[PDB]
Amino acid sequence: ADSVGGQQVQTIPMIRGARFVALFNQKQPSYFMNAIVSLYACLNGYLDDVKVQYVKFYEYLLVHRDLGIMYGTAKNKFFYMYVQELNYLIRFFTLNSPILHGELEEMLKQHTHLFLQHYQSKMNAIKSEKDVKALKNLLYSCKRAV
Amino acid sequence: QVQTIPMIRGARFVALFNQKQPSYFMNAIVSLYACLNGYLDDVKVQYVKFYEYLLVHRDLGIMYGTAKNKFFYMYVQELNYLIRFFTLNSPILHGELEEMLKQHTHLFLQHYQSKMNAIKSEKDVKALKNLLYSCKRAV
Amino acid sequence: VDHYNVAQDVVQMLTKYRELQDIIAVLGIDELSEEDKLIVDRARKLVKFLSQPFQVAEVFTGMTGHYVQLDDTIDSFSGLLMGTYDQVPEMAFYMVGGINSVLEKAKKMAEEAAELEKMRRAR
Amino acid sequence: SGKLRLYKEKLEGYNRFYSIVKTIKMVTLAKYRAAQGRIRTRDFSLRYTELAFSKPQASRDAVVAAKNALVYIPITTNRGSCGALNSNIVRCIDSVVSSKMVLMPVGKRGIDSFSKLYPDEFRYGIINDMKESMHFGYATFVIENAYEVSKDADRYQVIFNRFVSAGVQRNAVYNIPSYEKWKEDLADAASSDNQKNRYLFANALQNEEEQLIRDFFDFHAALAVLNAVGENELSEQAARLVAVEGQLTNISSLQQRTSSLYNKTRQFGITAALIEILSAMSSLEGNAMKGVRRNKFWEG
Numbered sequence: 175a176d177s178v179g180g181q182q183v184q185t186i187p188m189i190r191g192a193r194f195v196a197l198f199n200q201k202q203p204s205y206f207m208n209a210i211v212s213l214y215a216c217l218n219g220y221l222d223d224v225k226v227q228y229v230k231f232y233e234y235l236l237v238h239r240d241l242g243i244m245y246g247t248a249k250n251k252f253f254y255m256y257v258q259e260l261n262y263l264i265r266f267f268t269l270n271s272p273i274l275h276g277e278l279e280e281m282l283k284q285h286t287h288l289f290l291q292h293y294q295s296k297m298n299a300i301k302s303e304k305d306v307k308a309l310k311n312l313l314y315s316c317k318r319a320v
Numbered sequence: 321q322v323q324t325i326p327m328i329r330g331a332r333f334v335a336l337f338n339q340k341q342p343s344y345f346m347n348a349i350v351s352l353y354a355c356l357n358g359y360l361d362d363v364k365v366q367y368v369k370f371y372e373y374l375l376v377h378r379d380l381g382i383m384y385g386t387a388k389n390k391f392f393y394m395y396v397q398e399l400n401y402l403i404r405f406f407t408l409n410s411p412i413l414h415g416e417l418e419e420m421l422k423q424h425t426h427l428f429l430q431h432y433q434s435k436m437n438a439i440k441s442e443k444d445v446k447a448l449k450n451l452l453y454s455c456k457r458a459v
Numbered sequence: 460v461d462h463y464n465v466a467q468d469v470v471q472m473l474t475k476y477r478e479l480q481d482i483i484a485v486l487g488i489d490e491l492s493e494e495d496k497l498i499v500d501r502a503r504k505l506v507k508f509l510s511q512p513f514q515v516a517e518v519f520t521g522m523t524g525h526y527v528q529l530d531d532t533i534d535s536f537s538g539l540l541m542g543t544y545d546q547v548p549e550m551a552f553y554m555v556g557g558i559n560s561v562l563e564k565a566k567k568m569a570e571e572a573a574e575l576e577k578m579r580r581a582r
Numbered sequence: 583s584g585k586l587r588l589y590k591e592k593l594e595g596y597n598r599f600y601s602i603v604k605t606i607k608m609v610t611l612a613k614y615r616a617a618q619g620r621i622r623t624r625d626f627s628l629r630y631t632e633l634a635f636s637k638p639q640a641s642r643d644a645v646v647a648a649k650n651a652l653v654y655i656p657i658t659t660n661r662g663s664c665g666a667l668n669s670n671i672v673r674c675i676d677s678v679v680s681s682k683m684v685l686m687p688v689g690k691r692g693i694d695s696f697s698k699l700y701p702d703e704f705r706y707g708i709i710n711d712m713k714e715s716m717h718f719g720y721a722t723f724v725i726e727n728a729y730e731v732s733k734d735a736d737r738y739q740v741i742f743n744r745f746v747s748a749g750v751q752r753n754a755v756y757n758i759p760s761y762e763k764w765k766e767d768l769a770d771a772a773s774s775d776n777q778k779n780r781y782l783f784a785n786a787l788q789n790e791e792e793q794l795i796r797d798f799f800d801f802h803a804a805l806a807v808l809n810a811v812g813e814n815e816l817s818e819q820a821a822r823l824v825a826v827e828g829q830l831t832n833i834s835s836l837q838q839r840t841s842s843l844y845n846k847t848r849q850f851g852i853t854a855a856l857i858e859i860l861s862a863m864s865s866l867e868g869n870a871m872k873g874v875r876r877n878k879f880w881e882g
């Protein structure tokens with residue numbers, strides 16, 4: 175409200191408020207586990223290094239994919255986003271609990287590292303007439319996919 | 321802040337208009353005449369109510385034994401109908417009016433405002449504020 | 460008459476504090492004169508001193524509530540406005556009732572600070 | 583209705599305007615504070631410039647005596663909303679109108695204000711984008727353009743705004759006489775007992791070469807211009823805050839007035855609609871007529 179006509183200052187509250195506003199965009203209702211995990215990841219600053227345009231793609235990879243398993247780096251024993259039955263364990267035990275807090279942080283850190291290393295790096299190197307359109311279509315599809 | 325003669329008298333008049341109870345005709349007209357003729361120019365705005373209270377109720381001239389008027393005193397409430405008859409500018413009631421106003425202003429500036437301008441103690445500041453509150457509510 | 464005078468003084472100080480808050484937000488704290496700084500400190504103490512814990516909230520807040528007498532409030536605010544309690548820390552007025560509570564909280568804060576400093580010197 | 587929505591839209595627009603002006607106030611205050619640092623670092627660069635040019639002189643003889651061009655370099659802001667600075671500068675210039683007056687104003691507002699009022703006493707103006715810090719190069723550009731405007735000029739009067747405090751912005755003048763007149767005055771001070779405060783300064787200058795003296799003259803003239811522009815910028819930022827605060831107060835008054843009108847209009851509209859409906863209902867009821875009752879009246 176105090177930077178409408180001036181260059182904004184990229185402080186921590188704004189760096190996370192932008193992502194939070196970006197995450198609220200969705201077409202279909204979200205399963206509780208996916209939504210709470212994404213909100214927790216954005217709350218602890220795991221999306222600080224992710225551009226606001228790629229937040230939806232990051233969330234889609236977190237939910238419907240598993241970078242750790244893809245690159246053979248996942249070390250968690252049970253906490254994986256493909257285990258849809260962790261929703262009730264999360265509901266009974268909050269994310270800020272020793273049962274789930276450690277593996278949750280490990281998975282989020284690994285996913286953020288792999289994303290920044292592999293996907294966003296290629297996104298920032300897009301220079302063509304068709305790759306740009308393909309990236310735009312992918313981002314739009316991910317916007318209404320999660 | 322340029323303060324010309326009209327501004328000073330206007331501020332004093334606005335200060336005098338602050339009232340709680342209706343004022344007797346003689347007191348109100350005498351105070352208005354004193355303010356209009358520039359007798360409150362040296363009096364600070366915040367002390368106008370105290371000055372008016374001293375003029376109406378108390379009598380500095382009698383207190384310090386420096387009174388020269390024969391009849392014109394604020395304690396003589398009978399003068400109200402004499403003032404109402406001719407004017408405050410009549411030659412009968414003009415000389416004594418000016419004399420008592422000048423004496424009251426001189427004594428006030430010499431004794432009361434001089435001391436009020438030399439108050440720094442927190443207790444004395446509170447006492448002065450209480451005095452001003454009381455005066456503003458009683459003439 | 461004392462009640463009315465104290466109430467008017469508190470209102471005037473709060474209004475002046477709002478004006479000074481605007482000024483410092485524009486220019487800065489260090490630009491205020493000596494009188495303005497004292498007014499700001501007293502007004503902040505007043506704002507912190509107007510809060511009170513209710514006995515109804517003892518179960519939830521866990522701290523005993525206070526029932527302040529009328530004369531006690533008048534005396535406390537009159538003393539604060541004059542400047543008698545210019546040495547008490549600002550936080551001593553937060554969520555307390557009366558003036559005795561302020562003194563007790565200030566003493567407890569001083570004791571806690573002394574104990575912490577003594578422990579620090581050991582290590 | 584439409585009129586109610588009209589007032590609602592007007593109030594929303596005023597709110598948007600108020601928010602934008604508040605952001606402008608914040609931005610201006612940021613630069614006011616950011617370039618407030620000058621205050622600590624000023625009032626020491628121009629010490630021997632005083633000796634070079636400070637002279638208590640009458641405002642008439644210095645004006646009437648000269649028969650060559652009198653250059654004037656008023657300092658004016660590019661953007662409006664500063665306040666009364668430009669108006670006061672224009673008034674000062676108007677009071678000094680002469681057949682010898684020549685204007686090389688500074689800033690877009692100064693150009694646009696002195697071009698129309700003084701068409702035959704205006705040559706061209708200088709403009710600086712407020713992107714970098716006011717530096718020596720800008721002052722040198724101004725001085726070079728001033729010389730080229732009138733090289734045989736009796737003096738070069740710079741009029742600017744001095745920022746005494748956050749709320750005080752006075753008008754100040756720097757007078758820069760021609761090299762010949764300055765040399766004459768310097769020689770008189772060095773020789774005669776008069777101008778005893780500049781005696782050492784004048785004698786020191788005379789001992790040196792003439793190129794050094796000319797460089798000294800140009801260097802200190804540029805310093806004076808630099809001081810003038812810096813103070814004008816600071817005064818403009820401060821002065822600008824007053825104008826922005828005035829605009830905010832005006833916008834708030836307009837918002838209050840429009841809100842009052844909106845409330846009044848909606849109440850009147852509701853009342854009028856209800857009265858119209860009730861009038862229609864009463865008209866319908868009145869036309870109704872009670873017919874003959876078909877009941878056993880005798881059975882009672």
Ligand SMILES: O=c1ccn([C@@H]2O[C@H](COP(=O)(O)OP(=O)(O)OP(=O)(O)O)[C@@H](O)[C@H]2O)c(=O)[nH]1
Pocket residue numbers: 789790791
């Ligand atoms: O033919 C000449 C004569 C004199 N000068 C110049 O006139 C000035 C006379 O200066 P001084 O003779 O008064 O002082 P100085 O010995 O300390 O000289 P510097 O070492 O400071 O230069 C000096 O700055 C000298 O260079 C010339 O440049 N050319």
